[PDB]
């Protein structure tokens, strides 16, 4: 027949999977004027995107929510955003001093205010003091009568965070650099892995508020009007149960103690702060959930927990194991840290709740062992309403307990749709044509 | 090189015979001497505030050069200076008459006349001509 | 307070279509390939350094500035058992670049040193008359 010759094409719409660098592209309003928002790092890239979207309608791309790289690039960056911000603030090495702590006039908690001699920046004469110290940060030392010492002296350094900054979790949109198209599944029956039907293409991902909480997920993002629950093997016992429920469950948590301002001794140009006085009467902080909807919720969960084996033996159980930082429910609220007891939330089922919250001050970094941030609060009481669009469970009559040791799994619940592919725009094909040759 | 920014469009094409006043030639006679290797005779001696800024300066010298070659490259007008196309001008873009655009007008005012409409003209060259002619050329090689 | 439907095409919009329908679409994937706390800058060079390579390989092949062009390198039927009209009417590009992935290095050497190197020593010596 005819002779065929190769023919070069450019801009051919193909891709392979690649692992490249994405970049922050945040909000850009009210970042100026004292907003030292540590998530924004003063509005990281000021884009405020217009997230357009192109449907492709003939494309099947075999996704995977479990071998995704985008969740790995967050957990690199978030502690990396801490580490530059943890640097210039005040170091707290010279404070690990033996104490004399007595009972405070209006349980185990704030009973002990303390006193110790220190000579930080004057470097001439020591001076005793008065502070306010909770539990969960002190140790009654040996061979002495009522003498305390901070729990994390002989770890790495105990640098605090500065009061200019704010940990306010504004939504961050991950955009893609040139030559990379972030894709997104358009099937809401997407169970986590496998193929999709009519994958689209966005410039930039949707709202991701990088909140930090164990055992739940607060200001999250929720699917349509079925409850979807995904996991890795979903038969294996030591995996993580990602729960996406179709409605929100409203939460109130408050700190009724009128904590105030304060003046503690100065480092070298470094004023250090330790929580000033309460107004004179102590009410212990608590979360406060509308317990009807929560009771309504968990029977709705075993509707969709069930349909992978039989029609029998569903229960709910509370957590277990170790010190209360991994036991009790952890989350932040506006420059303040909460460890709340959540044993009441996990009664079993069949086919207004007040929770005792606990607050500490010396708080470990989230995954590294070693350094640890620190922040005394601002004046007044604290209130933050919130939401719930998910929780983290484990397998163990088939026992479900609230597990959790990685908020990447929270970010896996946020990024269960996305995939970044590089363009290989050059391509060739044969036809009958031929270059003119003389 | 901006010597005729107050001249008119019907007259600025006269002095544009010089290579846009040797436009790109000023870059190569710069980067021959921007690439004075005294930067390599020091390794900058450190990382300094200026070398951070020079690095962010050379990138924009790279990128914004390419965005003007690529658009000339895609328009079937690679490397030339005055090329015609096959796209018919639509009077909805500008209802100015002929001589007013050329004889009686600056350049930068004419930018603000069609800075709205500019992006539509970009697509209406490629998908109308340079996407289009390549298929019709390849049909004329089928025989 | 805006919004209208699609007019021309989208980005990667032809990537589920056939070759005969995607061949009239190449400009949209051609424009936006380049334009789009140090870690933005490390992206802004890789996006350049990938663009030059694809630009350079078109330059060597006598095919710079054109979107498509032909050569005189013969297609070898050992590379593809696919019939002709199946390729231009049934197969998408994303599938097509898994099928000729292995042969790609043989192709690029057999364009330059085969023809466009040879079309210059032949070209330079068509003088003297």
């Amino acid at each position, epitope marked *: 027949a005819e002779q065929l010759w190769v023919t070069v094409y450019y801009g051919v719409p193909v891709w392979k999977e690649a692992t490249t660098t994405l970049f922050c592209a945040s909000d850009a*309003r009210a970042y100026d004027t004292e907003v030292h928002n540590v998530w924004a790092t003063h509005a990281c890239v000021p884009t*405020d995107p*217009n997230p*357009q*979207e*192109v449907v492709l309608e003939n494309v099947t791309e075999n996704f995977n929510m479990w071998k995704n790289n985008m969740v790995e690039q967050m957990h690199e960056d978030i502690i990396s955003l801490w580490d530059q911000s943890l640097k210039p603030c005040v170091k707290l090495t010279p404070l690990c001093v033996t104490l004399n702590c007595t009972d405070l006039r209006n349980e185990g908690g704030e009973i002990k205010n303390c006193s110790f001699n220190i000579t930080t920046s004057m470097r001439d004469k020591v001076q005793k003091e008065y502070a306010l110290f909770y539990k969960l940060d002190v140790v009654p030392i040996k061979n002495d009568n009522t003498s305390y010492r901070l729990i994390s002296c002989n770890t790495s350094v105990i640098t605090q965070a500065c009061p200019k900054v704010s940990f306010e979790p504004i939504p961050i949109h991950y955009c893609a650099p040139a030559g990379f198209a972030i894709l997104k599944c358009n099937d809401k029956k997407f169970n986590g892995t496998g193929p999709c039907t009519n994958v689209s293409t966005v*410039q930039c991902t949707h709202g991701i508020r990088p909140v930090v909480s164990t055992q739940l997920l607060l200001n999250g993002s929720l699917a349509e009007e079925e409850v979807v629950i995904r996991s890795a093997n979903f038969t294996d016992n030591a995996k993580i149960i990602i729960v996406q429920l179709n409605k929100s469950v409203e939460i109130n948590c408050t700190r009724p103690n009128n904590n105030t301002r304060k003046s503690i001794h100065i480092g070298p140009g470094r004023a250090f702060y330790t929580t000033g006085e309460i107004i004179g009467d102590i009410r212990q902080a608590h979360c406060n959930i509308s317990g009807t909807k929560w009771n309504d919720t968990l029977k709705q969960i075993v509707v969709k927990l069930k349909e992978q084996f039989g029609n029998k033996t569903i229960v709910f159980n509370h957590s277990s194991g170790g010190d209360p930082e991994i036991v009790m429910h952890s989350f932040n609220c506006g420059g303040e840290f909460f460890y709340c007891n959540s044993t009441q939330l996990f009664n079993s089922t069949w086919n207004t709740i007040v929770l005792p919250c606990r607050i500490k001050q010396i708080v470990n970094m989230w995954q590294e062992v070693g350094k640890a941030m620190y922040a005394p609060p601002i004046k007044g009481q604290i209130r933050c309403s919130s939401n719930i669009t998910g929780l983290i469970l484990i397998r163990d009559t088939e026992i479900f307990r609230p597990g959790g040791g990685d908020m990447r799994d929270n970010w896996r619940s946020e990024l269960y749709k996305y995939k970044v592919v590089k363009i290989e725009p050059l391509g060739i094909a044969p036809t009958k044509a031929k270059r003119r040759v003389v | 090189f901006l010597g005729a920014a107050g001249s008119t469009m019907g007259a600025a094409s006269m002095t544009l015979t010089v290579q846009a006043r040797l436009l790109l030639s000023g870059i190569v006679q710069q980067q021959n001497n921007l690439l004075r290797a005294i930067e390599a005779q020091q390794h900058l001696l450190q990382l300094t505030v200026w070398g951070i800024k020079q690095l962010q300066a050379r990138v924009l010298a790279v990128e914004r050069y390419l965005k003007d070659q690529q658009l000339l490259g895609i328009w079937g007008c690679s490397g030339k200076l005055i090329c015609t196309t096959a796209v018919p001008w639509n009077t909805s873009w500008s209802n100015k008459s002929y001589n007013q655009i050329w004889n009686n007008m600056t350049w930068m005012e004419w930018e603000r006349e069609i800075d*709205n*409409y500019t*992006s*539509l003209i*970009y*697509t209406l060259i490629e998908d109308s001509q340079n996407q289009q002619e390549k298929n019709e050329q390849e049909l004329l090689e089928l025989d | *307070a*805006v*919004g*209208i*439907g*699609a*007019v*021309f*095409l*989208g*980005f990667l919009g032809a990537a589920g279509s056939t070759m005969g329908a995607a061949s009239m679409t190449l400009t*949209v994937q051609a*424009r*936006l390939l380049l334009s789009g706390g140090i870690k933005q800058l490390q992206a802004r060079v890789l996006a350049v350094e990938r663009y030059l390579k694809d630009q350079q390989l078109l330059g060597i092949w006598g095919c710079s500035g054109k979107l498509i062009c032909t050569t005189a390198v013969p297609w070898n039927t050992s590379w593809s058992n696919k019939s002709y009209n199946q390729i231009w009417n049934n197969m998408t590009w994303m599938e097509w670049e898994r099928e000729i992935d292995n042969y790609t290095s043989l192709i690029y050497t057999l364009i330059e040193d085969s023809q466009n190197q040879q079309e210059k020593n032949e070209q330079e010596l068509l003088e003297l008359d």
Partner: antibody, heavy 134, light 109 residues
Framework: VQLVESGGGVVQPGKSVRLSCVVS????????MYWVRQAPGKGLEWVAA????????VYSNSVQGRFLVSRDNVKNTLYLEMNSLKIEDTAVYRC????????????????????????????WGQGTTVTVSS | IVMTQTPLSLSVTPGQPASISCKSS???????????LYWYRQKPGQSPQLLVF???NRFSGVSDRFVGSGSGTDFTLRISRVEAEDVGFYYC?????????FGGGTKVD
């Protein structure tokens, strides 16, 4: 400038009329228009909107599909035709001009889709009134 | 979206400052760099007239004592030394997206 309407009055259910707002002096093809509905003793309800080139039309959900709007930039007219009339449509209609100027449609590069900008109103016509009853 | 306001009735006499705020459910900040909230006034029996278009700027034929401000959700219109002819209603009108709604219109006597 001068901004009034015409064709108002009173009709039955199931009927169909068309008003006529006429502008005076500004270049009419440059600007988009609107329609608003103040019920007697109530607030205001937005009705409709046309682009400047008469290409983009956005209706309220309640009156969706029933009404009709159009432009004639040469005759400088503005029409609100209506169909399938109900008694609760009895209110004051007002013809109204956008405050700002609008541009031509935009055509974002990344997706071949135009964009017509829409902002609010400054010049309300005094407007007619249509009553739907027996 | 939803956007109501408060208080409905402020039956006053001239000589004092006050303010009327309109409360937003969806936050307003368009990508142009501005917040499309338009405050204006009708008189009884009349088609309305524009008080201020943006929450910052004003309109022609407007006394200087008409000041407005607000965040993306909080929105406030303040009238210093409330004038004798401030009768009728005051509608808060937003221009985020469609259908663009109103407030009820605060009556001031």
């Amino acid at each position: 400038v001068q901004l009034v309407e015409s064709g108002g009055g009173v009709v039955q259910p199931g009927k169909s009329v068309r008003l006529s707002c006429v502008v005076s002096d500004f270049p009419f093809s440059k600007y988009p228009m609107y329609w608003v509905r103040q019920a007697p003793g109530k607030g205001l309800e937005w009705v409709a909107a046309i682009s400047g080139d008469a290409w983009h039309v956005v209706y309220s959900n309640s009156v969706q599909g029933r009404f009709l709007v159009s432009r004639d930039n040469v005759k400088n007219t503005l029409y609100l035709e209506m169909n399938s009339l109900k008694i609760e449509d009895t209110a004051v209609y007002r013809c109204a001009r956008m405050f700002q100027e609008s541009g031509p449609p935009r055509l974002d590069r990344w997706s071949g889709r135009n964009y017509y900008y829409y902002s609010g109103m400054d010049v309300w016509g005094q407007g007619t009134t249509v009553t739907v009853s027996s | 979206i939803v956007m109501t306001q408060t208080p409905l009735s402020l039956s006053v006499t001239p000589g004092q400052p006050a303010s009327i705020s309109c409360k937003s459910s969806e936050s307003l900040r368009q990508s142009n760099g501005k917040t499309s909230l338009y405050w204006y006034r009708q008189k009884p029996g009349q088609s309305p007239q524009l008080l201020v278009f943006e929450v910052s700027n004003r309109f022609s034929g407007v006394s200087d004592r008409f000041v407005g401000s607000g965040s993306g959700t909080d929105f406030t219109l303040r009238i210093s030394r409330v004038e004798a002819e401030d009768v009728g209603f005051y509608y808060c009108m937003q221009s985020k997206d469609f259908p663009l709604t109103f407030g009820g219109g605060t009556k001031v006597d």
